Amino acid sequence: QLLAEAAKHPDMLTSVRPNGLEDTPQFKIDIDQEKAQALGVSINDINTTL
Amino acid sequence: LKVNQDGSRVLLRDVAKIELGGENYDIIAEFNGQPASGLGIKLATGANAL
């Protein structure tokens, strides 16, 4: 919002840019706690092998 | 917490009241009789007060 606003002042502000990285797609894994305990699998074992 | 062989499940609330509460409940402040909080500030050794 502020970057767009500063773009409306090319006579005052120039090269106003973010000094960082942009958000990116991530791969989320959802471990089902129920089915895990229902198969005799430890969450610790899961989160370590992974 | 655990999945009964019966088929039921036991969750943390089933055995506890879960709420957001202070780390400790020892200190309680009142300003002119009304609820208050705040900071007691100690001057570092040698540092200027003003």
Side-chain angles (χ1 to χ4, degrees), chain A residues 5-7 9-20:
Chain A
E5 197 70 10
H9 296 85
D11 66 319
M12 203 73 180
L13 273 37
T14 171
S15 290
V16 274
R17 53 179 181 320
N19 188 29

Side-chain angles (χ1 to χ4, degrees), chain A residues 34 37-38, chain B residues 1-2:
Chain A
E34 178 178 352
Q37 299 184 11
Chain B
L1 296 186
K2 77 166 184 176

